[PDB]
DNA sequence: AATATTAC
């Protein structure tokens, strides 16, 4: 039985592809009961991987392991599914992930939150 | 969970 109930969010999708902003773009709308603040969004191509760090104005409860899954719009339309936890230190979490990135791999939306 | 070994 799998619940994440949280205002802040780290993803990490594995052996995915995904260009950042498009990732970044759906995972706002899927998101978008939470009212995200900021999101970051990191590909990493040395195992490939995303990461992304979301920003909730609302705790968040997640139930479905699979809701925040994603989907290539090109053949083969793959189902790309995340590692889904709450995020423990945001700053630690942004930090890990921006020092991974060139800035081309990189997407942001909104302000960071200066979490308490 | 459930990708996978990536994931503060
Ligand atoms: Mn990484
Ligand atoms: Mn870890």
Not at 33 to 49: D, G, W
Not at 50 to 68: D, G, Y
Not at 83 to 109: G, L
Request: aromatic share 12%; charged share 20%.
């Amino acid at each position: 039985r799998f619940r994440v109930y949280s205002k802040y969010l780290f993803l990490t999708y594995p052996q995915c592809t995904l260009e950042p902003q498009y990732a970044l773009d759906s995972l706002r709308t899927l998101l978008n009961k939470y009212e995200p603040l900021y999101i970051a969004a990191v590909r990493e191509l040395h195992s490939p991987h995303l990461h992304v760090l979301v920003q909730n104005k609302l705790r968040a409860s997640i139930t479905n392991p699979n809701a925040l899954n994603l989907r290539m719009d090109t053949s083969p339309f793959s189902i790309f599914h995340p590692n889904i936890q709450a995020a423990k230190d945001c700053n630690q979490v942004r930090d890990f992930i921006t020092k991974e990135v060139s800035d081309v791999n990189t997407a942001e939306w909104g302000t960071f939150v200066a979490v308490s």
